[PDB]
Amino acid sequence: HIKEKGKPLMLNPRTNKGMAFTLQERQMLGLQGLLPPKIETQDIQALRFHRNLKKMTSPLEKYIYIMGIQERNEKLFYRILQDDIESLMPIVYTPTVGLACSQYGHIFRRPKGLFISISDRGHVRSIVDNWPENHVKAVVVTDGERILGLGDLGVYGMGIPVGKLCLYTACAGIRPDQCLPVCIDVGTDNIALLKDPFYMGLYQKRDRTQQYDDLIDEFMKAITDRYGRNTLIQFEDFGNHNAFRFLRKYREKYCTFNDDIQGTAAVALAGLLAAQKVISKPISEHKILFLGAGEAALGIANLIVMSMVENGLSEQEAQKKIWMFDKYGLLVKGRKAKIDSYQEPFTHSAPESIPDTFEDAVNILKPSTIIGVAGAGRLFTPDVIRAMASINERPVIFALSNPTAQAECTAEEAYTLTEGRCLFASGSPFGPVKLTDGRVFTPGQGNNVYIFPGVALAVILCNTRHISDSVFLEAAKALTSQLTDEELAQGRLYPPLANIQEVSINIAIKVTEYLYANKMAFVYPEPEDKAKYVKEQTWRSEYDSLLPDVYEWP
Amino acid sequence: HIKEKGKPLMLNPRTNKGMAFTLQERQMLGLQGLLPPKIETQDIQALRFHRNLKKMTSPLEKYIYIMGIQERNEKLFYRILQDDIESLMPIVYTPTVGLACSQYGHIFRRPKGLFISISDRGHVRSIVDNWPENHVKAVVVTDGERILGLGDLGVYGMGIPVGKLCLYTACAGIRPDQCLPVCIDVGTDNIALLKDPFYMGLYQKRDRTQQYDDLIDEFMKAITDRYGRNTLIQFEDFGNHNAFRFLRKYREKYCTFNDDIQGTAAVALAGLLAAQKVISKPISEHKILFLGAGEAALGIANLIVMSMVENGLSEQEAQKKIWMFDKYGLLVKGRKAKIDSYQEPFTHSAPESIPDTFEDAVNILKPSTIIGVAGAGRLFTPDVIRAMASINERPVIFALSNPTAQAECTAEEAYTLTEGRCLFASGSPFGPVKLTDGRVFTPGQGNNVYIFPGVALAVILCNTRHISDSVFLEAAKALTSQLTDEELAQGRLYPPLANIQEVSINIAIKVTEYLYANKMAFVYPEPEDKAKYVKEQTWRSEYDSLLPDVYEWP
Amino acid sequence: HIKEKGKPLMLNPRTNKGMAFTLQERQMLGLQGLLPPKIETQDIQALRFHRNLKKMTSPLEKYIYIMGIQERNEKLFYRILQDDIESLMPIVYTPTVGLACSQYGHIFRRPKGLFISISDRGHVRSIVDNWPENHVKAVVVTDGERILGLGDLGVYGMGIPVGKLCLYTACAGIRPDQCLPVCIDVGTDNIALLKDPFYMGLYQKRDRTQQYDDLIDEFMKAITDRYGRNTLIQFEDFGNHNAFRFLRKYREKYCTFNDDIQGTAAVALAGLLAAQKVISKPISEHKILFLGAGEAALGIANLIVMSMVENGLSEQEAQKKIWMFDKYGLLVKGRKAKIDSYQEPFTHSAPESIPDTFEDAVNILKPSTIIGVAGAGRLFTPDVIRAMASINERPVIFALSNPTAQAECTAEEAYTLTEGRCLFASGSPFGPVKLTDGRVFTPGQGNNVYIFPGVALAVILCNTRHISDSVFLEAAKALTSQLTDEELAQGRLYPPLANIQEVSINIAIKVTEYLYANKMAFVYPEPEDKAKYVKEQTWRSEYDSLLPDVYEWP
Numbered sequence A, B, C: 001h002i003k004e005k006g007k008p009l010m011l012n013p014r015t016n017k018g019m020a021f022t023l024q025e026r027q028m029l030g031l032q033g034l035l036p037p038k039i040e041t042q043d044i045q046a047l048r049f050h051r052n053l054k055k056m057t058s059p060l061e062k063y064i065y066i067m068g069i070q071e072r073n074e075k076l077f078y079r080i081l082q083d084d085i086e087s088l089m090p091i092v093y094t095p096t097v098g099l100a101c102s103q104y105g106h107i108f109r110r111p112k113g114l115f116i117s118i119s120d121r122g123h124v125r126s127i128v129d130n131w132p133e134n135h136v137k138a139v140v141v142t143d144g145e146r147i148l149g150l151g152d153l154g155v156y157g158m159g160i161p162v163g164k165l166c167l168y169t170a171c172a173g174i175r176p177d178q179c180l181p182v183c184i185d186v187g188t189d190n191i192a193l194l195k196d197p198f199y200m201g202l203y204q205k206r207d208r209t210q211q212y213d214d215l216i217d218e219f220m221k222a223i224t225d226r227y228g229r230n231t232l233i234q235f236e237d238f239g240n241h242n243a244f245r246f247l248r249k250y251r252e253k254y255c256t257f258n259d260d261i262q263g264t265a266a267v268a269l270a271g272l273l274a275a276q277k278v279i280s281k282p283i284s285e286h287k288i289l290f291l292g293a294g295e296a297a298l299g300i301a302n303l304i305v306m307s308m309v310e311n312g313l314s315e316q317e318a319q320k321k322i323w324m325f326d327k328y329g330l331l332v333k334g335r336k337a338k339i340d341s342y343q344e345p346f347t348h349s350a351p352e353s354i355p356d357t358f359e360d361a362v363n364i365l366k367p368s369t370i371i372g373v374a375g376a377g378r379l380f381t382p383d384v385i386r387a388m389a390s391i392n393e394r395p396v397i398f399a400l401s402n403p404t405a406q407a408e409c410t411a412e413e414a415y416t417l418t419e420g421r422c423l424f425a426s427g428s429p430f431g432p433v434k435l436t437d438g439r440v441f442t443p444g445q446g447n448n449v450y451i452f453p454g455v456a457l458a459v460i461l462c463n464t465r466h467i468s469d470s471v472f473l474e475a476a477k478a479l480t481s482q483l484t485d486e487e488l489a490q491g492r493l494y495p496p497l498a499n500i501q502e503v504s505i506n507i508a509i510k511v512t513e514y515l516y517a518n519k520m521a522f523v524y525p526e527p528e529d530k531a532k533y534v535k536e537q538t539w540r541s542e543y544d545s546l547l548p549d550v551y552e553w554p
Ligand SMILES: Nc1ncnc2c1ncn2[C@@H]1O[C@H](COP(=O)(O)OP(=O)(O)OP(=O)(O)O)[C@@H](O)[C@H]1O
Pocket: A146, A148, A149, A239, A240, A260, A291, A292, A293, A294, A295, A296, A297, A325, A326, A327, A328, A372, A373, A374, A375, A376, A379, A400, A401, A402
């Protein structure tokens, strides 16, 4: 392997080992003299990194440093991430990745990923053909319209697919060279970016004409034409309107899913499932109120229904336990604000009185669970939280909007205002909370990073062609089944983040077993031990020998 | 022409333009899609850099950032340096480069330059053959034994040749692809480094056996075998003993000089020549006392003698005006401490009383000029400075040792203690000094950076075979002739550092004319207008077109 | 889209177009000046070739010239073959390819294919990894022990897999870059080659120990490990013993078949099927006698049985109609010479009298069909042919051994000696025969070239995993079904060789339809129109544009 020799082996982060290149590799591959005499181990290199990181102060500075390593020594980059994924997650992922995107054009050094603009319409294939890797298996694509809860960040949104894919590898051991981050640039409506001299995209408002849909269509076709019709394509951070219609339009034709609708749905469900274990509350007494009625809300709601239905409840009965409150208020039949086909099943006859605020909604409906997915800030006010604590003995409060500043409420607020009776989870990380009575609560992170890595690995290994909703239901069950009784008592609704790697692999195994049982896997020969197969297929951050095969002839 | 296309053009800092690649270049060279849709100008890129630099706090942090750009986008790296060489010089050069060196193994990211170790003895040519560039014209090599005034830093000393060559380009417009930084590693005697797990060299004490001389010989031969007998080889930061030995051994065989002996000699002389003009002092009344008697002292003294001789004094008369005081004391006939052949000419009959300290030496000898070049710290104590001010109306005080902490004294000390009557210069940069009467004094920097760039350019363009001392005498005159009377009154002993680029080119022009007039140039045909020739040959930081020549046939 | 520019595009035969590179391609790809100013069309190039070929005299000289083009301009090479496949077939294939193999080491210029020797045991994967093409779909491998009817030619046998693969492309439009010729070198028993200074293989007798089987196993594993478990592997020219055991050993584990046993079996049957339509003979009256009882005889006999079975006869009944006569005589129960399990079904109770010669066998058994497949020369003597003509009104005589000198008899001999009453076919080409009465007979060529190209294409496009005998039965029917009534009357037992391209495609079409109907195809999505799918997938000899995609941005 490795056709290149000389300087090019050092210039390419995929092969570059720095001083880890052995003496023999250096002499045989023409590197002797190009590196200091010192021969180092990956351990020493990782030590050098941690030593430097410790001296840094701002999260963004740390983000620039670690992400920079991905462009110098890929193996080391993942070794570093794997050394302590929990402490680096907030840096490479939410919330810092949100900060990085808002200033993407200012911290730019080297480009990452594939960029496809509306000005390239009709020539996307040639762009796809310029990507250096021939064996792409997974794609995470965004158009930058709904970056987390930050809004339209245009091409600055590329930091998201890059980050997601980094996690594909770090969490599920998916091969880096088989991952392709993609940014579709059709312009941006963010006035600030349009006047930013460092903006990385086209200086035009978003093209919302038929050319937009045609470009996306060309994208889907170009990607599958070169890499295969089963190439995994994960849509990420697309605006509400486009997110749904593209999922419906392509889910039966391509191997695709939307992380914000389906991935977030699975993590949220998983958390709810864990809470049900600690509370043992009757599915009939469940009253769920959503703050928001978009990608996440509808995604989570539908998965919840699927769960209730396979648990002895009719689809209609299940849907009736779910209410939604968007920017215009409670979704009730006959309201002024629009209601599409997706929201209809959750739009019920108006209650006795109509609420004006989410607080009114909580007091009127008396929900047992409250889920925040509006990406609009601290909407779960202290009064909202108190109401939930007065109405329920153990209220379930989920503040899922990212990044942190967009979260509906903090762990501190939830645990304190509910006297430690709530079951809380958030999308962005919060440290443990200690109440005056000495009890310490460790908030879980209901973020899709717990789901897309394992699901991606299973789909890829099984050569799955299409992803049904039932696949996410299974992932949700696979995630929650990994929680130990001790962890439940700790108030943890999700396995510890420090164990994300093994958790993701286990989810992968559980999903592959599900795919095979339901004829959705197409690999030959079919491995007898699915668990062993998945584990044997994972990419390792350990250095590989680049030495040519030299041997004696008799 | 460019033989590479695709990703490789972006991975090679020599060609990479970042978003400055034009639409045509991207499409024709297979980069479309690998870069953000945005097309930027070098101006915007430079702005991004300055914007980020401004937000940084420590010099070392800045060093890491700017030097990192040399490995990402070479054109931008030099553009950045050219925008404000005066404010960046302290970061990429002394004193920060000294700090960078001391922690080279800790800040390591990518290797820079060629490394040749004693363990590679007998295989140096193969290492030289690994260097990617085929047209090397200049080499700056060190063995790291005498890095500035910091001592033995071993392989960590590579930062020096790297910095020096960055200046070849930034100051004289010498092509970067024609420069080769070299570090000779024969071990190190620095105990701390030998126990440092991040050390970049062989873990052994310096090899001072015949094998050392043999290795250097192999180095000289290998470099010239591949690149040519006239390849410029600048020895830098070698220990005292080796420095002279190798200069004497190779100067008539190769195109080589020692920056620390000759380069420093020329800049120091230039300072003295400038002082000459501000105070109109008679060479007969010139009494010079050196603090130190090594590489710099001997180099400077020899050049000063050549200057006085050329001005009507006999070699003997001139040498009689020069005294040296090393770590053992005053160099006087019959002293216990050793006196070699180089020092003999400046070793006079012991005076009335023998001084214990440099202060005593000043009071006993009553020198009019004091030159600090002992690389040992603040040896020009407040009392030494006062003595010079009491003995002389306008004392000349030079504290040339680098980095800053090793300087004999600060500019503030010099100007205040002499009540603004001294003519001061230092190797390391000091800001302007304001006395209590409100007078402002701007200290000049007598650092060889004002000399080696211009001399290198001339020697390279003229294909000069060997460098005589007279070439440095000329460079010294060329440097000082650049000062305007206006500047002289401002305390200026050297042209503004902000004008280092034009100063170097002009020095390059004067030296080339000197080389031709003395049959030391071998270029043909001989250009009629030397100034025009030199200016046309300089490398520019502006991006070049990478477009293939496409055109219609008739 | 190509990743190479400059001279390399010309040095690589896959991309080199010679003077066919357009002006724009030359200017944009950096070829301007490297080619004569002239811009040519493939037509002109093909004209130049035919002009030169016409002036050549010996077939071997022509072989060297045409095969040389495969290493200079691949597109042109196939254009040339496609221009007149019928007149060149005798040159690149049998009989000339046999002559080329006999002196392969003497005409050597450039290597073709992958070579794996017993001395590489344990390192086969590294060899396989050295092959430049990443998407191999088909492999033709030989160990050179049974090269045609020429015997053990060792590494000189490489000429066979190379020729077979040229035909994969020329006849079925299979992509050249997806084909891999392989020679397994375990030594050779050919004493003449062991003393030949130009031999291209290991100088040792064949290794017949366990190491041989292990090397073949490593080969199979290595190829599939790198290219996929469904990679088509066509065994070619292996010795009798090895041919069968490897087919039995791997046919259910890998996608593999043996051309000599199965390919030849299908062509033969095809001819017999055609003959049955010209003479309308009831197979209860067909008595078949084989001259030989090896790879071809057993392969043909087995397919014949399968054909009679699906046509209303029991396996027992069908086998009884088949007799075989090898180098020891008639295969009869209780004979001295060995009879293995494959021959047992065709070994019957000795007849009234036991024949000494094949002639005696003909007179005693009175067969209606005689199939020569002993690779031992003119065993179908004039007396043998006369006997078949006196015993049968329309005797079927097949002389299938290659090359020409090994054929059991010529077309001239068969037609003349049977007074034009025989239905004849041969493995090697013979010109038309005109009898004294003016009748002209055109002998058909029952060579596997009519089968492997079409079968290979179907198996590749259908991602078939294993090849059953039924596939060859279908291929045989597909071949004969293409004969037109007018061609039957001509004495044609096979479609004209000049139409082998379309004949191969139609066979491929029929075989894929058969694969789908029998759940042996694994392609997604499944094309609705198989015929259209196959034809659209074929590689074309027309030059492709190598121009980068250049366009204007709005
Ligand atoms: N101030 C608000 N109060 C209540 N609901 C709001 C408010 N602001 C926005 N929303 C609702 O939040 C929903 C956001 O939907 P959208 O599809 O844009 O994102 P999402 O994926 O659901 O959110 P996130 O990814 O941040 O969890 C919308 O239904 C919107 O009406």
